[PDB]
Design a binder for this molecule. Structure first.
Ligand code: CLA
Ligand code: CLA
Ligand code: CLA
Ligand code: CLA
Ligand code: CLA
Ligand code: CLA
Ligand code: CLA
Ligand code: A1L1F
Ligand code: XAT
Ligand code: XAT
Ligand code: PQN
Lengths: 130, 80, 72, 153, 162, 147, 30, 223, 171, 34, 73
């Protein structure tokens, strides 16, 4: 019926990925579920989970993350999202250090932090021709 | 890709991180507030510019600021 | 261009993109630039340009034709 | 490449000018003007007082012949993979080397011969236009004078 | 006369003359193709016969409502186009016949979706076959009656030439 | 999808049609262009000013030439209160016979001139279709100077 | 009425102004 | 029938009420999809299967809307530009290229022949609009055969085009009320929200309410 | 039974296996078309497409043009033929520029294998990537396709004009 | 060639040929790569 | 009213909020700023006001036109 046994029991929708997620990048979300719960696809309609390993492919990181946020309502937490380039170039994305970004984990450095409030930003006229 | 900056007015309430739809922001250790945490933007290449992050900011004039910049298929939200 | 804003035109463009990508005899032709809806500022500019050009053209036509046809 | 193509066209057009002079002299080249009722108002040239002067039918026929030749050229242009000599240079191809002041004196059906004859024909067209503009006669009148009278006879 | 679709209650596996008891699978596929084509053509022919009899809007009226008479009144250049269209359709059907998993009368390729056919699918195929058979008998009767009597269906019925 | 917004690398990397749209609308915002200095800014503005004045002079020369060639300036001189000035002739293949007849003025369909150039040029002392031609020639020369 | 020579030389001078325009256009860079 | 103000007012009022109520029905369908729609309870049913191929529906409805608008309105514009160019024989008129509504005239003929043939117990047609005699009360016309020509063809196709575009806006609102390729979690933002932000190139009016707003505009146009 | 299933057993594609996308009739009909017919060089595909397209393109121009005639007119036929030929020229120009800006390949179905085997550590998009393996997806292939479209369009327009004249005269 | 033939020579030339070549050049330029 | 609608349909909330800022400054300068802080209409409410005014104006214009025309003749 389906290419892989771990795919959710989805009947296919004309809202899945397109030619872009065959030559630029595609995103895969994996998770393990205790029950074959019925959930709503980020793209189309209702799909059925597998009582075990579940693997879904999407065209955007936002679609995978919306599916994962929906999974949290099913008490599912072990979901992990990967980015796949045109060949099998798998990169773990969402649980980047194994801890969700909302929980503080040691080993993270601040990126994009300014040691002042908004009012300390430089005047644009002094940022001309650089 | 858009630019996201975090300012030391951060109170570490995590509402920005749990509102990001593309996993751009994360909470990192800090010593400038009671919570001991500050938001970070290490994955701005996935930033879409929806500005949900600063809609959930409780600080007075924001501690996370999104500056829209060059566009990308990821930042434009293109599924095609 | 002024009343209808973006977001409503991005999803429609996505539907058109799917239709083009999933139809035979036209799959042979594909765009190089991904078709997207006009940006918010661009949409405001285009609506303003249409408004102004239509305004100027209709009033020029009216004033000229009315003067010519009324005063011989 | 451009010089060679323009020389070929100039030689062919010297032939065409001779043919046009012959046709005008020998009772060919249809008479009158185009039918505005048949071909719309775009063929009307002027309305002096109640009569519509239209484009001459001879001009229309000559334009149709030139359209035939130009269409042949356009086909050859969009037929690059099947023609012996292309119109434009391929990426990588390098322009043949300029012939110089005097191309090599190689008689026959040689590149130098065609090159020299194309240059001569283009110079002849330049001289013909210059003579017509300076003196003030028709192009065919200048060709007739330059052939003694054997063309418009 | 097999586990083939088309066996109905009045006469199950109706092969009184034993045409299928000796034929192989290829000949039986040919027989099913012929039966289905005849049935479809006959359904179209019966519907056209009746509708033409009581409605012929095309050709600015004219084209006498009696069939087998309008057959010799069509401009004969519209006959050629109908012939060519039928020919192109059957060329496409021939091309279909070499597709893998082809079934005798299946030009929609339902074998792609229908694996482990149900009873509803078999019943609908039998419905199509039975309607085609009834239409074959009906069109044969129509043509024969119009030949011997000269009146069309609703004309002969209306007068009472029964 | 590259090399069109030569002045902006951020736009040239846009994979969408937005790059083409924004390439048009940011072409004259020289201060926002990539690898930009003040000297280049003023020099480019100076050259653009020269091209603009050339465009203005070419436009005026075209008006003069079309009044001299297809107008009725000389006829309008002798009867300025009854003769309607003509801007330029019309050649449109889509015209019917009725449109040709209605727009017909003297020898060819033409547009009445609503710019008031006839009165302006008459006031400053122009009486011949050869005076207008001289002005067009001189203005094209000035445009060449500015370019 | 202007002559053919008058219009022709004005067209030729206009061509020269065109070559000067592309030179300015190309000098203002791609 | 002879009180023309009453007839005109009644028709216009009832058509306006109908258009408003139809837009409201579309709005509340979208509201149901956002709020009261349960994905689990609707596994592989009609609602699920419609959402699963919403792209195809919306794309083909888009093509139909473009086709109908191009044709109807551009035939109007072609008539306008042919008249402006003095080419009266190139119009889409009765004395020119003619588009006779033959299907509607056939129906009109069928109704005026119904009494005695298909409605044998009828003495007169249901309405004189389909054909018959001119009915006048006090020298004022009550009803009369409404002839259909090329002018009615164009305006009827204009009606079809406007109705199709209104249906397009409202159906796009209903089907894309829960999710899309832009916003995969649009249902979490509710039925009524202004946007998701300036990102993704701009996500104005992606709601389903903003579709009942545009559909209200187009219903006004159509009515 | 169900007549709609996920396309090629992939429930995540933006496509469906309906009785129209993947029906045997659709398969055969699209496989007999010049764009997908097996055994055709790109020049042959272009020639057939151009012939058919010019043949049906001369129709609307001749019938409804600015120089129509309820009777047969040589001027109307010439006008329609010229309009059809110029439209084919415009379409050929579009094809040429599209092929110029789209592909950089001269022999496909190999370069993909070469870069999947012998590595493609270059600027990519020419060695790697490469969408489609058809011969129409090359610079040479599309050029011959456009040439065939243009020549076949001219020939088909002329043939259709001749047929129209014969039908209007002898019928 | 009279002066009144210049409109019929130039208006089609400009208003049709110049768009075609300009579109060709602009499309080629804006679709270039690096 | 139909033309009035276009103010809400064409404009945006930020401009009106920033104008209300200066109006509130004047009120505070005169000690008459209301306790209920004045805010510009929300984006959705701005759209709703625009569409309601547009519909009212257009339908009323057609209403008056139809009624006057068909009552006069
Ligand atoms: C509109 C005027 C015009 C005219 C009269 C011609 C005339 C001609 N062209 Mg030509 N050409 C033109 C415009 C024109 N061209 C343009 C604008 C282009 C660029 C697209 C070309 C590109 C072109 C090519 C590429 C070729 C010609 C060829 C020819 C010759 C074919 C005649 C023949 O078969 O002799 C018998 C003839 C010299 C062909 C040639 O050299 O002669 C056979 C040829 O191969 N032309
Ligand atoms: C075997 C089938 C068949 C044949 C040979 C004919 C033959 C004829 N019909 Mg006819 N007709 C048919 C079926 C058929 N009909 C059916 C089923 C209907 C009901 C819709 C009609 C309704 C009909 C009318 C209303 C009229 C005719 C008329 C005519 C005559 C002129 C041709 C014409 O205009 O056709 C017109 C045919 C149609 C409008 C409908 C044809 C629809 C076809 C049969 C279905 C699709 C065919 C498709 C291309 C192939 C199938 C695909 C797939 C199964 C492989 C001609 C004698 C005209 C006449 O002069 O009457 C005396 C006329 O006015 N027919
Ligand atoms: C591809 C499009 C196409 C085109 C342009 C035509 C064109 C034509 N058909 Mg036609 N036809 C087509 C497809 C087409 N056919 C198909 C697919 C069928 C189904 C088999 C038919 C069946 C058909 C019949 C049955 C008749 C025509 C006839 C005609 C002619 C008269 C039409 C008209 O209004 O007078 C302008 C005309 C030459 C009629 C004809 O030639 O009689 C003079 C006629 O009787 N056609
Ligand atoms: C007069 C103003 C006007 C016009 C022309 C349109 C036109 C259209 N709107 Mg609309 N719209 C308007 C005002 C208008 N709108 C307003 C004020 C609003 C605010 C509420 C909207 C809100 C709106 C929405 C929400 C939607 C539309 C849609 C549509 C399209 C329907 C499909 C169609 O007919 O395309 C065909 C195009 C036309 C009929 C326009 C004229 C084209 C001419 C007649 C033919 C072609 C001319 C030719 C190409 C010219 C070439 C020469 C040129 C290059 C020089 C169409 C483009 C729908 C859509 O996206 O399309 C499906 C849709 O969903 N509109
Ligand atoms: C959609 C609207 C529309 C339509 C239908 C027409 C129709 C027409 N115009 Mg027109 N026009 C329009 C809008 C429209 N106009 C507008 C908006 C303007 C102003 C800008 C004009 C300005 C205008 C002028 C100035 C002139 C016309 C002319 C014409 C006529 C000839 C056009 C021509 O050469 O056809 C070319 C047609 C084609 C190349 C074919 C296109 C259509 C094909 C048949 C579609 C086929 C689809 C097919 C069924 C798909 C299924 C295939 C199957 C195998 C699966 C024709 C009657 C001319 C005239 O005088 O005629 C009287 C003329 O001079 N028009
Ligand atoms: C900016 C000034 C200007 C403008 C707007 C026009 C406008 C027009 N001219 Mg024109 N013309 C002008 C200057 C101008 N002219 C000058 C200076 C000359 C002397 C050489 C002519 C000689 C001329 C002739 C001989 C004819 C026209 C014709 C026409 C009409 C059709 C267009 C055409 O065929 O152009 C053709 C124009 C030329 C061959 C001359 C070049 C025009 C100038 C020099 C270029 C100006 C460029 C401008 C500043 C910006 C260019 C933008 C570009 C990059 C896209 C149109 C009304 C035709 C007409 O009357 O039809 C009824 C016609 O037959 N013109
Ligand atoms: C300055 C701009 C301009 C100009 C000069 C023209 C000129 C013309 N248009 Mg046109 N048009 C334009 C802009 C323009 N258009 C725009 C912007 C639109 C969209 C709004 C239209 C929409 C339009 C329509 C809808 C129609 C025209 C038509 C016509 C023709 C007039 C009808 C006639 O009597 O010719 C009769 C025409 C002929 C006898 C044949 C002409 C065929 C082409 C044009 C000849 C080109 C020759 C060319 C050099 C060949 C190259 C070589 C090739 C063989 C390889 C004429 C050629 C009509 C027409 O003829 O359609 C084709 C027509 O139906 N136009
Ligand atoms: C302009 C003439 C002036 C005369 C005055 C009056 C005449 C007139 O009015 O003419 C116009 C006219 C007809 C003109 C017809 C013409 C020019 C036909 C030309 C056809 C050219 C062809 C086939 C070229 C083929 C070239 C090829 C294949 C070129 C090539 C090669 C080769 C050969 C090297 C091989 C290479 O091989 C490889 C490697 O590919 C490929 C390639 C491309 O390189 C009729 C006019 C009128 O009928 C009308 C309109 C109205 C009537 O009432 C009155 C008349 C009769 C007068
Ligand atoms: C191309 C050409 C003629 C082409 C003729 C063709 C195609 C023929 C066309 C015809 O057949 C058709 C189509 C149809 C027929 O019915 C009509 C004709 C007409 C017969 C003449 C060019 C003629 C070109 C000429 C004369 C060029 C002269 C250039 C000079 C002097 C340059 C000098 C400099 O380059 C230096 C030396 C140093 C630089 O630094 C400075 C400068 C000053 C720029
Ligand atoms: C070459 C040429 C024509 C060549 C024609 C060819 C090849 C035709 C080939 C054909 O295949 C076609 C195409 C078609 C076939 O059906 C016919 C044939 C025949 C088979 C004309 C040159 C024509 C050349 C001409 C007219 C030259 C004129 C030169 C002049 C006036 C020179 C003046 C000066 O020399 C002085 C006087 C003093 C100097 O100091 C200053 C200057 C100015 C340089
Ligand atoms: C003017 C304007 C405002 C400001 C408008 C405000 C603050 C409304 C003020 C309403 C007053 C305070 C009450 C209404 C007073 C009227 C006189 C009462 C209505 C008339 C009756 C007859 C119904 C917005 O907030 C806005 C938001 C989004 C898009 C466009 C706009 C916009 O155009």
């Amino acid at each position: 019926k389906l290419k892989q046994s771990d795919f959710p029991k989805f009947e296919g929708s004309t809202g899945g990925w397109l030619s872009a997620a065959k030559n630029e990048e595609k995103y895969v979300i994996i998770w393990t579920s205790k029950d074959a719960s019925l959930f709503e696809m980020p793209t189309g309609g209702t799909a059925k989970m597998n009582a075990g390993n579940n693997v879904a492919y999407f065209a955007r990181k936002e679609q995978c993350l919306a599916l994962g946020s929906q999974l949290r309502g099913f008490k599912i937490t072990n979901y992990k999202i990967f980015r796949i380039y045109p060949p099998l170039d798998i990169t773990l994305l969402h649980p980047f250090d194994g801890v969700f970004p909302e929980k503080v984990n040691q080993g993270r450095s601040p990126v994009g932090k300014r040691d002042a409030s908004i009012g300390g930003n430089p005047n644009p006229a002094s940022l001309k021709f650089q | 890709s858009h630019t996201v900056k975090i300012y030391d007015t951060c109170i570490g309430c995590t509402q920005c991180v749990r509102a990001c739809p593309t996993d751009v922001l994360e909470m990192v250790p800090w010593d400038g507030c009671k919570a001991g945490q500050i938001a970070s933007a290490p994955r701005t290449e996935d930033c879409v510019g929806c500005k949900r992050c600063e809609t959930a900011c409780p600080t007075d004039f924001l501690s996370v600021r999104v500056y829209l910049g060059g566009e990308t298929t990821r930042s434009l939200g293109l599924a095609y | 261009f002024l009343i209808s804003w973006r977001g409503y035109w991005q999803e429609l463009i996505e539907t058109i993109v799917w239709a083009h990508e999933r139809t035979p005899l036209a799959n042979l032709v594909r765009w190089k630039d991904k078709p997207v809806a006009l940006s918010i500022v661009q949409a405001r500019l285009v609506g303003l340009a249409h408004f102004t050009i239509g305004y100027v053209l209709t009033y020029a036509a009216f004033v000229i034709a009315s003067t010519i046809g009324k005063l011989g | 490449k451009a010089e060679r193509w323009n020389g070929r066209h100039a030689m062919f057009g010297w032939i065409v000018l001779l043919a046009t002079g012959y046709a005008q002299a020998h009772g060919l080249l249809p008479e009158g003007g185009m039918d505005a009722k048949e071909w719309g108002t775009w063929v009307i040239v002027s309305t002096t007082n109640g009569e519509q002067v239209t484009i001459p039918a001879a001009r229309a026929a000559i334009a149709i012949g030139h359209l035939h030749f130009g269409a042949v050229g356009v086909f050859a242009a969009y037929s690059k993979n099947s023609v012996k000599d292309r119109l434009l240079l391929e990426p990588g191809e390098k322009d043949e080397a300029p012939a110089g002041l005097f191309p090599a004196l190689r008689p026959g059906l040689t590149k130098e011969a065609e090159m020299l004859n194309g240059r001569v024909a283009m110079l002849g067209l330049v001289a013909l236009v210059a003579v017509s503009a300076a003196t003030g006669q028709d192009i065919l009148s200048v060709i007739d004078q330059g052939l003694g009278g054997l063309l418009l006879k | 006369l097999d586990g083939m679709i088309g066996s109905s209650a009045p006469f199950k596996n109706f092969d009184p003359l034993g045409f299928a008891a000796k034929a192989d699978q290829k000949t039986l596929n040919k027989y099913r193709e012929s039966e289905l084509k005849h049935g479809r053509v006959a359904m179209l022919a019966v519907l056209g016969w009746i509708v033409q009899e009581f409605w012929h809007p095309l050709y600015d009226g004219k084209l006498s409502s009696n069939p087998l008479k309008a057959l010799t009144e069509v401009p004969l250049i519209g006959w050629a186009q109908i012939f060519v269209a039928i020919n192109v359709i059957e060329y496409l059907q021939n091309k279909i016949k070499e597709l893998p998993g082809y079934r005798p009368g299946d030009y929609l390729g339902t074998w792609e979706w229908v694996e482990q056919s149900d009873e509803g699918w078999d019943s609908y195929q039998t419905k199509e076959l039975n309607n085609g058979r009834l239409a074959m008998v009906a069109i044969a009767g129509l043509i024969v009656q119009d030949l011997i009597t000269g009146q069309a269906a609703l004309e002969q019925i209306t007068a009472g030439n029964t | 999808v590259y090399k069109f917004p030569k002045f902006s690398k951020a736009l040239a990397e846009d994979p969408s049609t937005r790059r083409i749209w924004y390439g048009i609308a940011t072409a004259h915002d020289f201060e926002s262009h990539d690898a930009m200095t003040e000297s280049k800014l003023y020099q480019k503005i100076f050259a653009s000013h020269f091209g603009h004045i050339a465009i203005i002079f070419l436009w005026t020369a075209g008006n003069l030439f079309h009044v001299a060639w297809q107008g009725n300036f000389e006829a309008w001189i002798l009867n300025p209160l009854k003769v309607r000035p003509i801007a330029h002739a019309i050649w449109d293949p889509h015209f019917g016979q009725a449109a040709y007849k209605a727009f017909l003025k003297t020898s060819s369909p033409a547009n009445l001139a609503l710019s008031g150039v006839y009165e302006w040029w008459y006031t400053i002392g122009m009486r011949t279709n050869n005076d207008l031609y001289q002005g067009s020639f001189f203005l094209i020369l000035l445009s060449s100077l500015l370019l | 009425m202007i002559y053919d020579s008058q219009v022709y030389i004005a067209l030729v001078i206009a061509v020269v102004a065109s070559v000067l325009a592309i030179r300015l256009g190309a000098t203002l860079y791609n | 029938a002879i009180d023309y103000p009453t007839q005109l007012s009644l028709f216009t009022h009832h058509v306006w009420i109908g258009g408003f109520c139809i837009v409201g029905g579309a709005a509340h369908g979208a509201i149901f999809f956002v709020r009261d729609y349960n994905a689990a309870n609707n596994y592989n049913n009609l609602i699920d299967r419609v959402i699963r191929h919403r792209d195809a529906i919306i794309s083909h409805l888009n093509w139909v809307c473009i086709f109908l608008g191009c044709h109807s309105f551009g035939l109007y514009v072609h008539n306008d530009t042919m008249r402006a160019l003095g080419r009266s024989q190139d119009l889409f008129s009765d004395n020119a290229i003619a588009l006779k509504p033959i299907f509607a005239q056939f129906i009109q003929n069928l109704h005026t022949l119904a009494p005695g043939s298909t409605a044998p117990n009828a003495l007169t047609t249901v309405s004189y609009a389909f054909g018959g005699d001119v009915i006048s009360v006090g020298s004022k016309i009550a009803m009369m055969p409404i002839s259909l020509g090329t002018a009615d063809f164009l305006v009827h196709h204009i009606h079809a085009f406007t109705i199709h575009v209104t249906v397009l806006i409202l159906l796009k609102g209903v089907l894309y009320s829960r999710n899309s390729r832009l916003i995969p979690d649009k249902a979490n933002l509710g039925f009524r929200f202004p946007c998701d932000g300036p990102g993704r190139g701009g996500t104005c009016q992606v709601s389903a309410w903003d579709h009942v707003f545009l559909g209200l505009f187009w219903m006004y146009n159509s009515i | 039974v169900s007549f709609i299933k996920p396309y090629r057993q992939d429930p995540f594609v933006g496509h469906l296996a309906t009785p129209i996308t993947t029906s045997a009739f659709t398969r055969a009909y699209l496989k007999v078309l010049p764009a997908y017919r097996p055994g055709l060089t790109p020049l042959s595909r272009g020639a057939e497409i151009g012939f058919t397209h010019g043949y049906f393109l001369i129709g609307p121009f001749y019938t409804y043009g600015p120089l129509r005639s309820v009777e047969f007119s040589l001027t109307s036929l010439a006008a329609g033929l010229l309009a059809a030929i110029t439209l084919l020229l415009i379409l050929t120009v579009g094809l040429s520029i599209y092929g110029q800006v789209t592909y950089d390949v001269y022999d496909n179905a190999l370069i993909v294998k070469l870069v999947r085997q012998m590595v493609g550590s270059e600027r990519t998009q020419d060695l790697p990537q490469i969408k489609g393996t058809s011969e129409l997806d090359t610079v040479l292939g599309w050029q011959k396709f456009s040439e065939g479209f243009f020549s076949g369009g001219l020939i088909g327009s002329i043939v259709a004009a001749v047929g129209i004249a014969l039908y209007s005269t002898y019928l | 060639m009279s002066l009144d033939l210049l409109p019929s020579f130039f208006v089609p030339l400009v208003g049709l040929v110049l768009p075609l070549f300009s579109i060709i050049g602009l499309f080629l330029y804006i679709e270039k790569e690096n | 009213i139909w033309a009035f609608s276009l103010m809400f349909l064409f404009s945006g909330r930020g401009y009106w909020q920033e104008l209300i800022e200066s109006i509130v400054w004047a009120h505070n300068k005169l000690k008459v700023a209301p306790s209920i802080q004045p805010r510009a209409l929300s984006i959705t409410q701005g759209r709703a006001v625009g569409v309601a005014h547009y519909l009212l104006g257009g339908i009323g214009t057609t209403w008056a036109f139809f009624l006057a025309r068909i009552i006069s003749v």
